Design a binder for this molecule. Structure first.
Ligand SMILES: *[C@@H]1O[C@H](CO)[C@@H](O)[C@H](O)[C@H]1NC(C)=O
Ligand SMILES: *[C@@H]1O[C@H](CO)[C@@H](O)[C@H](O)[C@H]1NC(C)=O
Ligand SMILES: *[C@@H]1O[C@H](CO)[C@@H](O)[C@H](O)[C@H]1NC(C)=O
Ligand SMILES: *[C@@H]1O[C@H](CO)[C@@H](O)[C@H](O)[C@H]1NC(C)=O
Ligand SMILES: *[C@@H]1O[C@H](CO)[C@@H](O)[C@H](O)[C@H]1NC(C)=O
Ligand SMILES: *[C@@H]1O[C@H](CO)[C@@H](O)[C@H](O)[C@H]1NC(C)=O
Ligand SMILES: [Ca+2]
Ligand SMILES: [Ca+2]
Ligand SMILES: [Ca+2]
Ligand SMILES: [Ca+2]
Ligand SMILES: [Ca+2]
Lengths: 323, 478, 388, 98
C-alpha cells in the first residue's frame, strides 16, 4: 500500500481513507486533510451551497492556491495561468484532468471534468491527518475524531466541527437537506433499483468482493436515485467511485464502462480509457523512455496516434514547431 | 451498583443541609487549600475527612507531593532555583532568601534585558548610559556607558563602543580588543580573562562584565547594591515594572522615549517613534521571507533545547530573532542570526543546562587557525561546548572570583602537568610560567602593584616583574 | 513621554502625582488599587500588571483573601469553540463568609443566582450591592474594597483596594507590586512554566491538566492568518495614537491574533479585543473614538442612541425615586438617550411624566394616590411624595 | 562590495588568469534573490566555485577565515573518546588519494 485515498464523488458524498461513506451538503470551506499536532500544509474544500466548487492548498502560512472545476486557478487573489509550479507544488493536467502534486509534502490532489475531488496521501501520516477525510489508520469505524477529539456516531455534525471561516465570509452550521424523495416515490424505486444492483450481479464487478464490499456503495446510491427525474445515469457516479476504490487496492478492473451506458465527461477528442500512462507521449516531446516507471492511472486520453498539442488531440503528421 | 473499596465511604445528600459538599467537592491535593463549589452531593464514594484522592489512590496521609514543573516531589525533596535551595517542608516549599546575581544583556543589536527582567526595544544611535551608580543621592562610583553607531536598523554594521568609568579610570573596548586610556588607582581588583569567545572583566568585589567580542554586553552585579543604580537596565530592586524610571524620575510607558532621556550628548539625535508592526523593514510586505526566518528561528524550540525550554521562556529571545534578521541583510556573515541563539544558549548554561546546538551547516565556529603558527600540529585547541571561564594560567595562576560558570568557545586541552599561556598559543609546563614567589607566600605571577601603602615604618616592598627574587627600598618621607 | 513641561507643574498618573523641580520629578509611593482581569478566550492579567495565558478546562481559583478569609472567587473554564486553543469563561462563583457564608454565582447571561435562587437586580443586602451598569453588564460591590464586572461572555474584572496589600493568593497573584513572583503555586515557590501554575490552582482532581500552551493556533486555521494581520493592525494605527503613551499595546495585539483565529466567529472576537485595549486606555484617562460601520459599532435600539462619554446617574427611572443617593460614577460609554428622556423598565426610555415610583420596591404607576389610615402618599412624576 | 572579494589582494594571482567578471555577476545575482539567514551558503559557495578553478590552474588560495564562511572540521574528531584530531581543513589537498 504505502498510500491512501479520499474522494468526494458526485453530490455531497464522501469517502474517507478507510471505507467509511456518508453525505454532507456543506455551505462554506472545510478542512479535508492536514496534520493535527503540527500542519506543514492543509488541503481545503469550498462548498457554495451543498454543491462543491474549489480545492485549496494552504501551505502553512504564506502560500495559497484555489483550483476548481472553473480551472481558472489563482494564487492568493491574482489569477495565474496554468500550468504552475511554485513552492514545490506542480499544478498540472493529467489525462485531460487537473492535478496538484506535493510529493515533497506528501500528497497528490486532482479533479475530474464533472468535479470529484480526490486526495492521494503517503503512509507518513498514518494516525496523523485528522479532518474531513478522517485519520489514516487501519480501522474504519473510529475515523470520526472531531476537532476536539471525540468519537461521534453522526457523520454530519462531525463535518461541521471541521469548518474554517474567512473575513470575506463567516459561515454557520449548514442544515441537512429536506428530502423531496419521501413523497415522489412512485415507480422510481422499482425500475431503477437495477443500476445499483449491477455492481453485485455483473461479472466485471463480481471479483473485487474479496478486496472490498459494495454494500455501502449500493446503500449510498439508493438515496440519490430518487431526486433526479428520468435517468439511469444517476447510478454511475456512485458506481464510478467503486471502480477506482478497487483499483487503488492493487486490483484493477477493465472495460466496465463498455456496457454500463455511462462514460465520465471529457473534452473533445478524448474519452475515458482505463489505466493510461501519465507520461502521455505528446507532440513537442523528447523521445525518452524508462524514466516514467510511475504507477498506472485512470483518465481519458487520445487515440492510438493523434498526439496531444495544447489540450487537443491532433494527428502526428501535423506536429508544429515553435520559436 | 458497585460497593466501593474499603478505605473510603459512600456518602448521601441530607434533605436539610444545603452544604452537601460531597462528590462534587472531591478533595485532592491540589484543591485542599482551595475552596470548592457544590450544589448537592451525588451517589458517589468519597475519602474520609482526614484523607484525600491521589491519581486513583486514596492516599492515607497529608504527605502527598509538592508539585513543581508538573512533577512529583516527596516531602523533604529539594530543588535548586537560581542560587537558592527550597524544600516543601509540608505541602508548601519554603525557599531561602539569598538574592542571586542579576544580569543585564544586549540581545542582538537593539534590545535590552534589565536586571529584574524586562525585554524592551530601543534602537538608538547616540551614546547611552547602560548603567551607573551616580543616581540621585549617592557617591557615583562606576559609570558604565555604551555607544552605538549606525544601529537603528540592525545589520552587519553597528560596531559598539563601550567606555566604563570606575575608580577614576578609563578603560574602553571596541573592534575586538580592550584599550586602557587611563589606568585606575586600585589596580588590585582589576582582572581580565580572555577565555573562549568572551572577555570576562572584573572590577571589584561587586561588579563584573562580559563581552562576546561582537555585540553582547552582560554586566553582572552582586547583593551589595539593591537599589543603588539607574540607567537603561533599571534600578535592581526586584520590582520589574519600575525599570522605566527615566532620568527625570518618573515611569514611562513607551521605552523609545525612555532611552532618549539617558543619552550623554544632549544635542545629538533622539530616535524616531517607529510605527509598530510584527514585520520589520525587509519582512514588511515580504510574507515569503518571513516564514523562512520564522521556521529557522524555531530552533529556539527544537529537540535539543527541550530541557531549557522548561526553565527559560524562549518567547522573549524568539521575537528578537525575527526582528534582527528581517532588518539585517546577512550575506557573508550570518552573525545577526547565529548570535541570538548563543545569547539563549548561554542563559541556558547559567542554569546548568549545557547545550551543543552548533553544527557544520549551521554557524560552524572553527578553531583551527590557532593550531597553525607551530610547524608541528599539536592541535590542543577545541571548540568545547561550555567550558569553565575561570581557569589557571601563567598570567593568572590563582583561582579568581568566577561570575560565569562556563562558556562556549575555543578552549585549550593538553594532558596534565601543562598550564596555558596566551602569548605562546600552546600550553606549557608550570615552570615555564613567569611566576613569582618572593619570601615564601603564595600570590599572583608578579603583578605590577606597589604593596603596603598603609604604614611607612613597615614599608617592606617586594615587587616581581617576571621571576625576580627581588625587594626594593622605600623612599622615606623625611 | 517625549514632550516637555515647565517646572512646578504637577501631572498625575492614575496612581499618584508627580511634580517637576530641578529637572527631577518628585513622586509619592502610596499604593493604588489593582485589577485582575479575564477576557477574550483565556487571557489573564495579574494584579501586578502581568499578562499571560492558561487554557485549562476546570474550576480554577482566581482570587482569595489568604491571611483571613473575607472572600474567595472561583472561575470556571470550558472549551468554547471547535478548536482546542479556545477556552472561554462560562461562569464565576463568589463566596462571602461574612454574610451567611452564602454563594453567589454569575451566569453565562447577565444573570445572577444566590444559593440556587435567581434574583432580580438590584439586590441591596447589607453590604454587597449588585446592579446593572449599562443594563447589559452586572456589577457586584461588596463593601468599598471590592468590585466585579460581567461574566456573561467572559470579561471578568476585579477592583481591590490597598487594604488587601500582599495578603491574597490565586492566579491573579499576591497584589504586592512585584510582577515576577506571580507564578507562585500554593506550595509557595515561583514556577517558570505557566502550564504548572494554572493547573496548580484547579479544584477538581478528575480534570485533565494540560502539557503545552500553544501560541499560534492560526496554524490549525491557516485561513485566518491574513485577516488576523490587517484586522488588529488598526490597534497600532494612529486611531489609538492617544494611548500608546498610556499603556503598552503589544500584548493587546498579541491577544487578538490568538482569538480571531481560534474562536467560532471572528467578528465579535475582534471587536471584544479592541475594546479590551480602549477600556484600559480609558482607565488611565485617554478616551478613543474607534467605532465605525465597519469597525463594530453597536446597535443601540431605536429608543436609545450611541454615546461616547456620558453620565449613568440621570438615566434610570429609579434615580428619581431615590435622588438623594450619591452617584460618584465616571463618564462611561454605552447606549443612552437624550436628557429629556429617562429609562423605563421595558426597553424604551420616556419623559419624567410617566416615570413610575419604586416605593418600598413597589412599582407604582405615574398616578397612584395611596394611603393607609395614618399616612398619606402619592407618586407624581417619579418621586414618591409621602406625608403624615 | 562583499562580492569584490573576487577582486581582493589574495586572488591577485588568479585575477590575471581567470576572468572574474563572469563569476562576479553570479555573486550579485544569487544573494540578491537568496534570503540568507542562518546559512550564508548562497554566497560562500560562489567564491569556492572561483577558488577551485583558480586551483586547477595551479594557484592554491586560502581565503576562508573565521568571520567569513568558517568550515570547521572538528565534529569528526569526536566519536573517539581520545582526541587524536588527525582531520584538518587546508587550502587544497590532492582530490585523489588511496
Ligand atoms: C470562472 O472563470 C471565469 C473565466 O475566467 C471568470 O470570469 C469567473 O469570474 C470565474 N468564476 C469563479 C467562480 O471564479
Ligand atoms: C495513535 O495515536 C494515538 C494518540 O497519540 C495513540 O494513543 C495510539 O497509540 C496511536 N496508535 C498507533 C497505531 O500508532
Ligand atoms: C523552612 O522551613 C523549615 C521548617 O519549618 C525550617 O526548618 C527552615 O529553617 C526554613 N528555611 C527557610 C530558608 O526559611
Ligand atoms: C570538553 O567537553 C567535553 C564534553 O562536554 C567534556 O567531557 C570535557 O571535559 C571538556 N574538556 C575541556 C578541556 O573543557
Ligand atoms: C627584577 O627587578 C630588579 C630590580 O630590583 C631588576 O634589576 C631585574 O632586572 C628584574 N629581573 C627580572 C628578571 O625582571
Ligand atoms: C596546507 O596544505 C598544503 C598542501 O597540502 C601543505 O603543503 C601545507 O604544509 C599545509 N599547511 C598547514 C598549515 O597545514
Ligand atoms: Ca480511518
Ligand atoms: Ca526595577
Ligand atoms: Ca551545578
Ligand atoms: Ca505578586
Ligand atoms: Ca603543476
Amino acid at each position: 500500500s504505502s498510500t491512501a485515498r479520499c474522494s468526494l464523488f458526485g453530490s455531497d458524498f464522501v469517502n474517507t481513507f478507510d471505507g467509511s461513506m456518508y453525505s454532507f451538503a456543506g455551505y462554506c470551506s472545510y478542512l479535508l486533510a492536514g496534520g493535527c499536532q503540527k500542519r506543514s500544509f492543509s488541503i481545503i474544500g469550498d462548498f457554495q451551497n451543498g454543491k462543491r466548487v474549489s480545492l485549496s492548498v494552504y501551505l502553512g502560512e504564506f502560500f495559497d492556491i484555489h483550483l476548481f472545476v472553473n480551472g481558472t486557478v489563482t494564487q492568493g487573489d491574482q489569477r495565474v495561468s496554468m500550468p504552475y509550479a511554485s513552492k514545490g507544488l506542480y499544478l498540472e493536467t493529467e489525462a485531460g484532468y487537473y492535478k496538484l502534486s506535493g510529493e515533497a509534502y506528501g500528497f497528490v490532489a486532482r479533479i475530474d471534468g464533472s468535479g470529484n475531488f480526490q486526495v492521494l496521501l503517503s503512509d507518513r501520516y498514518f494516525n496523523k491527518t485528522c479532518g474531513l477525510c478522517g485519520n489514516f489508520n487501519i480501522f474504519a469505524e473510529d475515523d470520526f475524531m472531531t476537532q476536539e477529539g471525540t468519537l461521534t456516531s453522526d457523520p454530519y455534525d462531525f463535518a461541521n466541527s471541521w469548518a474554517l471561516s474567512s473575513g470575506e465570509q463567516w459561515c454557520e452550521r449548514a442544515s441537512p437537506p429536506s428530502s423531496s424523495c419521501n413523497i415522489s416515490s412512485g415507480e422510481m424505486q422499482k425500475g431503477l433499483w437495477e443500476q445499483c444492483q449491477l455492481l453485485k450481479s455483473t461479472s466485471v464487478f463480481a471479483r473485487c468482493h474479496p478486496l472490498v464490499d459494495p454494500e455501502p456503495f449500493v446503500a449510498l446510491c439508493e438515496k440519490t436515485l430518487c431526486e433526479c427525474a428520468g435517468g439511469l445515469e444517476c447510478a454511475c457516479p456512485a458506481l464510478l467511485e467503486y471502480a477506482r476504490t478497487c483499483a487503488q487496492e492493487g486490483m484493477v478492473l477493465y472495460g466496465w464502462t463498455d456496457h454500463s451506458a455511462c462514460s465520465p465527461v471529457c473534452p473533445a477528442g478524448m474519452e475515458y480509457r482505463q489505466c493510461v500512462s501519465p507520461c502521455a507521449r505528446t507532440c513537442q516531446s523528447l523521445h525518452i523512455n524508462e524514466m516514467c516507471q510511475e504507477r498506472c492511472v485512470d483518465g481519458c486520453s487520445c487515440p492510438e496516434g493523434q498526439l496531444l498539442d495544447e489540450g487537443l488531440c491532433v494527428e502526428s503528421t501535423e506536429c508544429p514547431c515553435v520559436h | 451498583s458497585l460497593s466501593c473499596r474499603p478505605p473510603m465511604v459512600k456518602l448521601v445528600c441530607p434533605a436539610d443541609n444545603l452544604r452537601a459538599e460531597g462528590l462534587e467537592c472531591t478533595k485532592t491535593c491540589q484543591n485542599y487549600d482551595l475552596e470548592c463549589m457544590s450544589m448537592g452531593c451525588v451517589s458517589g464514594c468519597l475519602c474520609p475527612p482526614g484523607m484525600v484522592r491521589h491519581e486513583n489512590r486514596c492516599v492515607a496521609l497529608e504527605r502527598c507531593p509538592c508539585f513543581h514543573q508538573g512533577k512529583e516531589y516527596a516531602p523533604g525533596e529539594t530543588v535548586k532555583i537560581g542560587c537558592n535551595t527550597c524544600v516543601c517542608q509540608d505541602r508548601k516549599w519554603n525557599c531561602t532568601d539569598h538574592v542571586c546575581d542579576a544580569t543585564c544583556s544586549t540581545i542582538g543589536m537593539a534590545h535590552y534585558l534589565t536586571f529584574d527582567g524586562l525585554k524592551y526595544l530601543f534602537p538608538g544611535e547616540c551614546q547611552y548610559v547602560l548603567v551607573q551608580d551616580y543616581c540621585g543621592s549617592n557617591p557615583g562610583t562606576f559609570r558604565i556607558l555604551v555607544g552605538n553607531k549606525g544601529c537603528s536598523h540592525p545589520s552587519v554594521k553597528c560596531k559598539k563602543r563601550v567606555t566604563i568609568l570606575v575608580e577614576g579610570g578609563e578603560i574602553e573596548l571596541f573592534d575586538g580588543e580592550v584599550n586602557v586610556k587611563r589606568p585606575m588607582k586600585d589596580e588590585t581588583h582589576f582582572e581580565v580573562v580572555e577565555s573562549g569567545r568572551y572577555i570576562i572583566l572584573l572590577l571589584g568585589k561587586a561588579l563584573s562584565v562580559v563581552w562576546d567580542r561582537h555585540l553582547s554586553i552582560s554586566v553582572v552585579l552582586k547583593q551589595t547594591y539593591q537599589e543603588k543604580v539607574c540607567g537603561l537596565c533599571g534600578n535592581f530592586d526586584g520590582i520589574q515594572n519600575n525599570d522605566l524610571t527615566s532620568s527625570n524620575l518618573q515611569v514611562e510607558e513607551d521605552p523609545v522615549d525612555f532611552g532618549n532621556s539617558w543619552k550623554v550628548s544632549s544635542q545629538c539625535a533622539d530616535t524616531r517613534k517607529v510605527p509598530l508592526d510584527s514585520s520589520p523593514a525587509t519582512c514588511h510586505n515580504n510574507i515569503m521571507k518571513q516564514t523562512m526566518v520564522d521556521s529557522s528561528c524555531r530552533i529556539l524550540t527544537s529537540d535539543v533545547f527541550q530541557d531549557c525550554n522548561k526553565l527559560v521562556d524562549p518567547e522573549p529571545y524568539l521575537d528578537v530573532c525575527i526582528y534582527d534578521t528581517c532588518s539585517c541583510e546577512s550575506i557573508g556573515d550570518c552573525a545577526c542570526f547565529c548570535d541570538t541563539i548563543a545569547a539563549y544558549a548561554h542563559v541556558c548554561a547559567q542554569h546548568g543546562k549545557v547545550v551543543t546546538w552548533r553544527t557544520a551547516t549551521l554557524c560552524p565556529q572553527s578553531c583551527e587557525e590557532r593550531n597553525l603558527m607551530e610547524n608541528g600540529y599539536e592541535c590542543m585547541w577545541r571548540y568545547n561546548s561550555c567550558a569553565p571561564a575561570c581557569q589557571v594560567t601563567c598570567q593568572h595562576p590563582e583561582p579568581l572570583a568566577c561570575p560565569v560558570q562556563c562558556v562556549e568557545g575555543c578552549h585549550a586541552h593538553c594532558p596534565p602537568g601543562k598550564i596555558l599561556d596566551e602569548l605562546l598559543q600552546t600550553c606549557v609546563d608550570p615552570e615555564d610560567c613567569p611566576v613569582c614567589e618572593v619570601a615564601g607566600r603564595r600570590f599572583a605571577s608578579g603583578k605590577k602593584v606597589t604593596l603596603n601603602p598603609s604604614d611607612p615604618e613597615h614599608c617592606q616592598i617586594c615587587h616581581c616583574d617576571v621571576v625576580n627574587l627581588t625587594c626594593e627600598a622605600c623612599q622615606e618621607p623625611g | 513621554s517625549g514632550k516637555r513641561y515647565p517646572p512646578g507643574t504637577s501631572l498625575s498618573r492614575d496612581c499618584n502625582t508627580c511634580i517637576c523641580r530641578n529637572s527631577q520629578w518628585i513622586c509619592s509611593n502610596e499604593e493604588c488599587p489593582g485589577e485582575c482581569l479575564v477576557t477574550g478566550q483565556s487571557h489573564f492579567k495579574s494584579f501586578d500588571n502581568r499578562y499571560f495565558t492558561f487554557s485549562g478546562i476546570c474550576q480554577y481559583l482566581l482570587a482569595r483573601d489568604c491571611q483571613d478569609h473575607s472572600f474567595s472567587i472561583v472561575i470556571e473554564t470550558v472549551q468554547c469553540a471547535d478548536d482546542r486553543d479556545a477556552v472561554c469563561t462560562r461562569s464565576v462563583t463568589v463566596r462571602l463568609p461574612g454574610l451567611h457564608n452564602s454563594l453567589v454565582k454569575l451566569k453565562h447571561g447577565a444573570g445572577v443566582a444566590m444559593d440556587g435562587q435567581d434574583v432580580q437586580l438590584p439586590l441591596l443586602k447589607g453590604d454587597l450591592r449588585i446592579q446593572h451598569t449599562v443594563t447589559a453588564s452586572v456589577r457586584l460591590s461588596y463593601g468599598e474594597d471590592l468590585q466585579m464586572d460581567w461574566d456573561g461572555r467572559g470579561r471578568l474584572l476585579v477592583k481591590l483596594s490597598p487594604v488587601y496589600a500582599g495578603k491574597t493568593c490565586g492566579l491573579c497573584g499576591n497584589y504586592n507590586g512585584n510582577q515576577g513572583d506571580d507564578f507562585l503555586t500554593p506550595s509557595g515557590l515561583a514556577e517558570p512554566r505557566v502550564e504548572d501554575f494554572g493547573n496548580a490552582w484547579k479544584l477538581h482532581g478528575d480534570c485533565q491538566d494540560l502539557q503545552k500552551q500553544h501560541s499560534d493556533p492560526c496554524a490549525l486555521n491557516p485561513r485566518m492568518t491574513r485577516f488576523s494581520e490587517e484586522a488588529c493592525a488598526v490597534l497600532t494605527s494612529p486611531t489609538f495614537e492617544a494611548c500608546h503613551r498610556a499603556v503598552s499595546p503589544l500584548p493587546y495585539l498579541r491577544n487578538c491574533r490568538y482569538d480571531v483565529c481560534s474562536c467560532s466567529d471572528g467578528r465579535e472576537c475582534l471587536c471584544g479585543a479592541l475594546a479590551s485595549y480602549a477600556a484600559a486606555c480609558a482607565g488611565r484617562g485617554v478616551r478613543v473614538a474607534w467605532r465605525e460601520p465597519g469597525r463594530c459599532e453597536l446597535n443601540c435600539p431605536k429608543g436609545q442612541v450611541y454615546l461616547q462619554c456620558g453620565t449613568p446617574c440621570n438615566l434610570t427611572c429609579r434615580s428619581l425615586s431615590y435622588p438623594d443617593e450619591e452617584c460618584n460614577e465616571a463618564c462611561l460609554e454605552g447606549c443612552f438617550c437624550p436628557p429629556g428622556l429617562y429609562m423605563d423598565e421595558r426597553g424604551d426610555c420616556v419623559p419624567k411624566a410617566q416615570c413610575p415610583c419604586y416605593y418600598d420596591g413597589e412599582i407604582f404607576q405615574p398616578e397612584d394616590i395611596f394611603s393607609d389610615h395614618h399616612t398619606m402618599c402619592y407618586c407624581e412624576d417619579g418621586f414618591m411624595h409621602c406625608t403624615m
